[PDB]
Each structure stands twice: as C-alpha cells, then as structure tokens.
Amino acid sequence: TLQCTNVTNNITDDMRGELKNCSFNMTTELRDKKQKVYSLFYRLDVVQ
Amino acid sequence: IRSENITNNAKNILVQFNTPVQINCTRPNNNTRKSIRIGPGQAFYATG
Amino acid sequence: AENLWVTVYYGVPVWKDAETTLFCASDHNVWATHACVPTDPNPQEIHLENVTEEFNMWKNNMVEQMHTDIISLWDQSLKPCVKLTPLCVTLQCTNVTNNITDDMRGELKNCSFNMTTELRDKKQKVYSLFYRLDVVQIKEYRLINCNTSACTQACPKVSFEPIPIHYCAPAGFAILKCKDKKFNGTGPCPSVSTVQCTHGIKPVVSTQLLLNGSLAEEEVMIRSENITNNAKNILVQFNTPVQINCTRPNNNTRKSIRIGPGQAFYATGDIIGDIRQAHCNVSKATWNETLGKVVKQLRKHFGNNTIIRFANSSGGDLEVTTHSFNCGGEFFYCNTSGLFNSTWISNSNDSITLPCRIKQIINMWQRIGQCMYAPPIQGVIRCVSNITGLILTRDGGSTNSTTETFRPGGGDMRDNWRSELYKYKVVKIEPLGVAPTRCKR
Numbered sequence A: 001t002l003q004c005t006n007v008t009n010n011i012t013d014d015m016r017g018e019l020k021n022c023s024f025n026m027t028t029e030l031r032d033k034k035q036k037v038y039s040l041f042y043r044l045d046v047v048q
Numbered sequence B: 001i002r003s004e005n006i007t008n009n010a011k012n013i014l015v016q017f018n019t020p021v022q023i024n025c026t027r028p029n030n031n032t033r034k035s036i037r038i039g040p041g042q043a044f045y046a047t048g
Numbered sequence C: 001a002e003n004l005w006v007t008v009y010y011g012v013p014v015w016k017d018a019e020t021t022l023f024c025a026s027d028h029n030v031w032a033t034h035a036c037v038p039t040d041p042n043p044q045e046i047h048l049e050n051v052t053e054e055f056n057m058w059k060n061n062m063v064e065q066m067h068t069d070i071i072s073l074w075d076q077s078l079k080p081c082v083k084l085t086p087l088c089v090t091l092q093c094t095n096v097t098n099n100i101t102d103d104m105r106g107e108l109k110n111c112s113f114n115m116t117t118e119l120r121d122k123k124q125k126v127y128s129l130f131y132r133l134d135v136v137q138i139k140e141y142r143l144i145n146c147n148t149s150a151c152t153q154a155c156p157k158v159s160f161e162p163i164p165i166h167y168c169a170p171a172g173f174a175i176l177k178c179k180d181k182k183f184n185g186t187g188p189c190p191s192v193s194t195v196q197c198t199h200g201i202k203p204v205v206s207t208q209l210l211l212n213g214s215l216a217e218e219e220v221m222i223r224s225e226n227i228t229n230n231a232k233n234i235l236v237q238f239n240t241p242v243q244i245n246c247t248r249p250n251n252n253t254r255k256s257i258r259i260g261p262g263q264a265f266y267a268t269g270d271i272i273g274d275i276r277q278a279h280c281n282v283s284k285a286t287w288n289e290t291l292g293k294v295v296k297q298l299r300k301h302f303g304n305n306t307i308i309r310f311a312n313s314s315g316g317d318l319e320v321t322t323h324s325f326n327c328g329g330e331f332f333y334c335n336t337s338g339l340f341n342s343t344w345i346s347n348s349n350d351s352i353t354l355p356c357r358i359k360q361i362i363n364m365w366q367r368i369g370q371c372m373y374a375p376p377i378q379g380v381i382r383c384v385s386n387i388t389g390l391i392l393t394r395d396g397g398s399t400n401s402t403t404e405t406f407r408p409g410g411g412d413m414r415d416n417w418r419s420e421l422y423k424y425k426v427v428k429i430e431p432l433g434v435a436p437t438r439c440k441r
C-alpha cells in the first residue's frame, strides 16, 4: 500500500497530478525489520 | 509505400522516407535516483 | 628436368597448437563424475621418438578450461540446496565461555534468533553457535553476508573430498605430454608422448601450499613465468612430500531446524566437552630440510651468495593471508607464520603448530555476491595431507640490497591447476599434406 500526495513544488500547469510522492513500508536486508521510504511515481504507474 | 494489400484497410501501410526528419526528444527534469536496500544484495532504485 | 608433380597424402602425422573443449573421464560429491566417461583400464601412451615440442605452462588453455569446469561443477552442486534467505535476521549473541581456552575467547558466539517454521504464520525461537568470523555487530549481530547476498547451504550429503579427474581430447585432437624430468614448464621438451587422457588430477582447493598433488621425480622444481618479475608467482614443486596433520578437536553437535516445508537449516548445537583451537602440525626437521632444498634451488636463479629469507604473507583477505583449505567438510584458515620465518646465509620429534580458524560462510572463487554456507560436521575432525609444493611471491628486489625475500601467495586457483597441467598441451591433427613426387595422374 502506497500513501501518496501530489507533487506541487515547481510544477507547470501541464504537470499537475502527473507525479505522486508516495511513502511506503519496505523490507530491509534483515528479515525482521521494516523501513519507511518514499519515491516519486508517475500517475500512469499507480492506481488508487 | 508498401502494403500487403493496399485496397484492404485492415492492412498496415509502411511508408519509407527518402530523407529523414529530425526529432529531438527531451525529458528536462533533473531526476535524482536513490537506492533502497530491499533485501540481501537487492536494491530498488527510487526517484528521490 | 625434375618432372615433379603435386601429390596429396592423407593421414600425415602433423599437428598445430589448438584450443578445444576437453572432456572428463574418471574411474554424492561436488566433482560430479556422473557426467564423466569411464576411464580406460589400460590407457595407451604413445612415446613419440625424435619429437621436440614447444611447451608453455603459463599460456596453457587447459588450465583455463579446467578452472571453468571446476567452478561450474561447484555451482551446479549447490543449485538443489537450501537458500538461507530466512537466516538474515537480527541475532542476539553472547560469548561462549564454558570450557574455552585463552586462545578461543570471543571466537564463538551463542546466538539466539527468531526463525520461520513450516507453517507460514508461526515463528520459533532457536539458537546456534556461530564463529566470530561469520557475524558482525549491528549484543545484536547479523551474518557477515547479509548486506551482500543470500547464502546457499551446502547439501549435507554432498562430499567435498577431491576425486581425480582425467582430461581427454576429442577426435582430431591429441594431448602431448612432456616426459622430461627437470622440465621447468617452458621451452622445448625433447621427450614427448601422446596420451588420450591426462593422469588423474584431484581438484584440491588451497592457498599458500599445494596439497595432495604430484611430486617431482628428481629434485625441487622452481617454475615462474618470468623469474625476474616479482609480480609473477613462483610455483615450487617438492620431490618429497611434507606431512601436515590438521585437526578441529571440538566435538561438534549438529541440530536440524525446520525453516520451511522441506527446508532444514543445520545449526551448531553445543560443543561436547572442552573448547579448544583447531590447528595443523608439520614436522620441524622435514620442513627445515625441505626449505633447504628450496633455497638451494632458488640460489640458481637469484645468485650463489645471496641471502634467501622466508617471511609472512603481506596482507589482504583471510583467504590469501592464510593457508586456507578444506578438511572433511570444514573450512580451515591456518596462520603459516611459523613456516615462513627464517633467513638462509650462503656457506628431533617436535613440530611446528599452525593455529587455524574455522569459517562457515565461504566465498570459494574470487567472486563477490555468491556465497556458500558450510553445515557443521558432527564430531571431531582430523585429516592428514601431503604438502607437495608452494606458491611464493618475491618481495621487492631492487638492486639496493642483496637479500631476497619470499612470502606465501595464492588466492587464484589457476596456479593450483597449472601445477598439475604444466607438462600437458593440446594439439589438432593436420592430416592433409602436399609434397613433390615423380608420379603423374
């Protein structure tokens, strides 16, 4: 599950909603640990 | 102009130019890549 | 006046230096002989009169192919084996201090951890004894390999003991063998034969000391690609072997932990009795007079009044700075500082004890990201081997000084394979020939 917000810092009118700032929990090298990370995804790559 | 059956509109027409047309394609964003260790020897490359 | 015409001869005895793929012959084990042709009970050697052949052990492609074959056999013997991905967890480790000697302090860690079971929704608290060399602190530890790659446990039924392997040329190729004793591997061999397969060569993996190999029949043989280049390894072959006795004396207990459906991880349970260091013994007098032989043969290359000194390995990985080898499933890394510690000036029953450290996480060939976990061996382990040679490296050697210093080397197993294939080469037969003769068709 991705928790996504809108990327709105220095975007043009034709880039609105095109990039998602998504934070998620991810596995680590140790099987018993999780890391909260984030990534920029494209609107075409994620579905609500 | 090359078509398997030019009178069949279900056949694709292949056009070959004698002179090329120059196309200049850019992604202008200065993208930052970060690397996330998701397992032993396993990296996922996120957009920072 | 001559009246000579072209004449074609088929079946001529002519050959060229060639590179081809040799095949395996032999009389559960890593060095899979279930894909090797049976060896002929009476192999045929054809002694070629008057044939003087060019040999070069340092460009022998047989060595490269054999290295590839050994690596591939190692890789495919590990494929149907447990991948220890679950083992990359947090370990809660304490010191093993019950009946340890002063030289085993901190060497063993008693590590408890949570592990998966055969049921996906259940965890088991288990513990294991790990070696100081295998764990790194994050009281909390992790296995050394967990930030590089997951490790494959060696299947406990597969044996690591080397089996002799014979290398045979295909149709249209011949293996030429140099029968010349005193041969130093490069140049013209005037005593040549043809063999369909090489002799049984055991894939003995070791560093700084060649074990269980072939001996020189006349005297100690020094072989270097360019003896005056100190960046080239010197291969020493003994005429008489040196007996080395290596033991891990701990009475190890192996327990089996079900980490998944049909998946077992073999942990070290508890050492029954006293905990004390693994080691190797070499006869002091035998080693001393063997080094005397090596020195007498090195003076032939480095001067007759020079000082010949033997010193420790310079540095690097634990694989290269120690005599690293495999003794009945366990992986030893022995400190050969009591062996190479002496100077030689031109003019009883005790033994040298080399302390050894055990490892379970193994990177055999000089590769990164592909590691093997050695399961613990039940009980005490002891082996006896022949040192039949050395891999040395000369130190510096500018014209400033008259002392030559040699240090144990190794790491690259191609030098181990080159010490057995030095007297072999592969050629391809060129049967067609054209000559002048008086006939006309």
Ligand SMILES: *[C@@H]1O[C@H](CO)[C@@H](O[C@@H]2O[C@H](CO)[C@@H](O[C@@H]3O[C@H](CO)[C@@H](O)[C@H](O[C@H]4O[C@H](CO)[C@@H](O)[C@H](O)[C@@H]4O[C@H]4O[C@H](CO)[C@@H](O)[C@H](O)[C@@H]4O)[C@@H]3O)[C@H](O)[C@H]2NC(C)=O)[C@H](O)[C@H]1NC(C)=O
Pocket (backbone or CB within 6 Å): C156, C159, C160, C161, C162, C204, C206, C211, C212, C325, C326, C327, C328, C329, C377, C378, C379, C382, C383, C384, C385, C386
């Ligand atoms: C140089 O050559 C010498 C001589 O050839 C080598 O020394 C010999 O090495 C072999 C192998 O290490 C050794 O054979 C072992 O002897 C033990 C004592 O008799 C045996 O216990 C052992 O058998 C066990 O292991 C085999 C696989 O290795 C299994 O097939 C076998 O079933 C046994 O396994 C059972 O028992 C163990 C322990 O409880 C358990 O883990 C298993 O699951 C299973 O229950 C071998 O037969 C010779 O004894 C050595 N000989 C001498 C004189 O030392 C030397 O190693 C070579 N050097 C190098 C560097 O290669």
Ligand SMILES: *[C@@H]1O[C@H](CO)[C@@H](O[C@@H]2O[C@H](CO)[C@@H](O)[C@H](O)[C@H]2NC(C)=O)[C@H](O)[C@H]1NC(C)=O
Pocket (backbone or CB within 6 Å): A006, A007, A008, A009, A021, A038
């Ligand atoms: C995407 O979201 C993350 C998290 O909200 C942003 O990272 C934060 O950036 C601020 C400064 O801008 C820092 O003070 C925070 O500490 C950061 N948080 C983390 C978890 O790193 C990031 O800037 C956002 N990126 C975009 C393009 O919107």
Ligand SMILES: *[C@@H]1O[C@H](CO)[C@@H](O[C@@H]2O[C@H](CO)[C@@H](O)[C@H](O)[C@H]2NC(C)=O)[C@H](O)[C@H]1NC(C)=O
Pocket (backbone or CB within 6 Å): A001, A002, A003, A023, A024, A025, A036
């Ligand atoms: C990462 O995981 C944590 C915990 O697993 C999430 O935090 C929990 O969020 C739920 C709501 O869905 C709450 O009910 C819990 O109380 C939270 N627990 C903690 C410890 O905070 C967190 O939301 C996850 N983050 C992302 C980006 O998915």
Ligand SMILES: *[C@@H]1O[C@H](CO)[C@@H](O[C@@H]2O[C@H](CO)[C@@H](O)[C@H](O)[C@H]2NC(C)=O)[C@H](O)[C@H]1NC(C)=O
Pocket (backbone or CB within 6 Å): B005, B007, B008
């Ligand atoms: C090119 O494609 C057309 C369309 O499929 C072919 O002509 C049709 O053939 C069907 C066959 O039953 C007739 O019912 C149609 O009346 C035809 N239409 C026309 C416009 O001719 C035509 O035969 C194809 N050409 C070739 C060379 O195969």
Ligand SMILES: *[C@@H]1O[C@H](CO)[C@@H](O[C@@H]2O[C@H](CO)[C@@H](O)[C@H](O)[C@H]2NC(C)=O)[C@H](O)[C@H]1NC(C)=O
Pocket (backbone or CB within 6 Å): B024, B025, B026
């Ligand atoms: C595509 O064309 C546009 C103009 O229509 C280019 O935008 C110009 O880029 C140059 C970069 O050297 C700037 O100096 C101009 O100020 C830009 N003008 C405008 C109106 O944006 C764009 O760079 C071109 N892209 C490619 C890949 O050729």
Ligand SMILES: *[C@@H]1O[C@H](CO)[C@@H](O[C@@H]2O[C@H](CO)[C@@H](O)[C@H](O)[C@H]2NC(C)=O)[C@H](O)[C@H]1NC(C)=O
Pocket (backbone or CB within 6 Å): C095, C096, C097, C098, C110, C127, C270, C271
């Ligand atoms: C390693 O640690 C384990 C756990 O601390 C030890 O196992 C315990 O041994 C005592 C007797 O010495 C028993 O009473 C406990 O029930 C055992 N605990 C478990 C979880 O089995 C083990 O003896 C230690 N081994 C070494 C070599 O230190």
Ligand SMILES: *[C@@H]1O[C@H](CO)[C@@H](O[C@@H]2O[C@H](CO)[C@@H](O)[C@H](O)[C@H]2NC(C)=O)[C@H](O)[C@H]1NC(C)=O
Pocket (backbone or CB within 6 Å): C090, C091, C092, C112, C113, C114, C125
């Ligand atoms: C095995 O897992 C259990 C539970 O997942 C661990 O016990 C927890 O330890 C944390 C500290 O890291 C405490 O905050 C929790 O309250 C503990 N929970 C319980 C139920 O005891 C335990 O430490 C793990 N064991 C090992 C060896 O890693």
Ligand SMILES: *[C@@H]1O[C@H](CO)[C@@H](O[C@@H]2O[C@H](CO)[C@@H](O)[C@H](O)[C@H]2NC(C)=O)[C@H](O)[C@H]1NC(C)=O
Pocket (backbone or CB within 6 Å): C212, C213, C215, C241, C384, C385, C386
């Ligand atoms: C260590 O070296 C000795 C001496 O070369 C080996 O003993 C010889 O074994 C061969 C078997 O191929 C016999 O034909 C010789 O007669 C033996 N010679 C002596 C003096 O015993 C011994 O087998 C070697 N040990 C190992 C483990 O390689």
Ligand SMILES: *[C@@H]1O[C@H](CO)[C@@H](O[C@@H]2O[C@H](CO)[C@@H](O)[C@H](O)[C@H]2NC(C)=O)[C@H](O)[C@H]1NC(C)=O
Pocket (backbone or CB within 6 Å): C226, C228, C229
């Ligand atoms: C053995 O290797 C050495 C490399 O050190 C070769 O000699 C050197 O060649 C370079 C080439 O420019 C010179 O700069 C060095 O001065 C040479 N070394 C010495 C000590 O003179 C040498 O030719 C090689 N031997 C053979 C037979 O190939």
Ligand SMILES: *[C@@H]1O[C@H](CO)[C@@H](O[C@@H]2O[C@H](CO)[C@@H](O)[C@H](O)[C@H]2NC(C)=O)[C@H](O)[C@H]1NC(C)=O
Pocket (backbone or CB within 6 Å): C245, C246, C247, C279, C280, C281, C351, C353, C382
């Ligand atoms: C290596 O040599 C040492 C001696 O320095 C051996 O230790 C002896 O082992 C025997 C076993 O039969 C005992 O009876 C002696 O009391 C031990 N003496 C000492 C001083 O430790 C050791 O066993 C040898 N190991 C091998 C593998 O040969």
Ligand SMILES: *[C@@H]1O[C@H](CO)[C@@H](O[C@@H]2O[C@H](CO)[C@@H](O)[C@H](O)[C@H]2NC(C)=O)[C@H](O)[C@H]1NC(C)=O
Pocket (backbone or CB within 6 Å): C243, C244, C245, C281, C282, C283, C349, C351, C384
């Ligand atoms: C290595 O072990 C062998 C035995 O496995 C030792 O050979 C013994 O040597 C003594 C001489 O001190 C003889 O009395 C015994 O009869 C030999 N035993 C056998 C079975 O041959 C050898 O001495 C050991 N070498 C070292 C350096 O420890």
Ligand SMILES: *[C@@H]1O[C@H](CO)[C@@H](O[C@@H]2O[C@H](CO)[C@@H](O)[C@H](O)[C@H]2NC(C)=O)[C@H](O)[C@H]1NC(C)=O
Pocket (backbone or CB within 6 Å): C312, C313, C314, C315, C321, C322, C335, C337
């Ligand atoms: C070869 O011998 C030297 C000295 O005889 C060893 O150097 C020692 O290294 C350890 C490791 O940190 C130090 O604690 C000692 O203080 C060093 N001794 C001296 C006298 O400086 C060297 O380690 C040996 N070579 C190998 C490969 O072990």
Ligand SMILES: *[C@@H]1O[C@H](CO)[C@@H](O[C@@H]2O[C@H](CO)[C@@H](O)[C@H](O)[C@H]2NC(C)=O)[C@H](O)[C@H]1NC(C)=O
Pocket (backbone or CB within 6 Å): C335, C337, C338
């Ligand atoms: C290999 O053995 C030598 C000889 O014992 C080690 O050198 C000793 O190192 C200790 C430090 O732990 C010093 O206290 C001794 O004085 C050193 N002795 C000599 C003769 O130099 C050497 O450290 C060992 N190699 C490794 C890698 O541990």
Ligand SMILES: *[C@@H]1O[C@H](CO)[C@@H](O)[C@H](O)[C@H]1NC(C)=O
Pocket (backbone or CB within 6 Å): A005, A006, A016, A017
């Ligand atoms: C993100 O932006 C798009 C377009 O500006 C908008 O339709 C969408 O509702 C926004 N989502 C948010 C603010 O969560």
Ligand SMILES: *[C@@H]1O[C@H](CO)[C@@H](O)[C@H](O)[C@H]1NC(C)=O
Pocket (backbone or CB within 6 Å): B030
């Ligand atoms: C992109 O950003 C990096 C880091 O700030 C900078 O060094 C680089 O010059 C930038 N590239 C462009 C084309 O602006």
Ligand SMILES: *[C@@H]1O[C@H](CO)[C@@H](O)[C@H](O)[C@H]1NC(C)=O
Pocket (backbone or CB within 6 Å): C094, C095, C105, C106
């Ligand atoms: C384990 O023993 C070593 C050497 O005796 C010591 O340096 C280390 O601190 C010990 N660790 C413990 C008691 O956790």
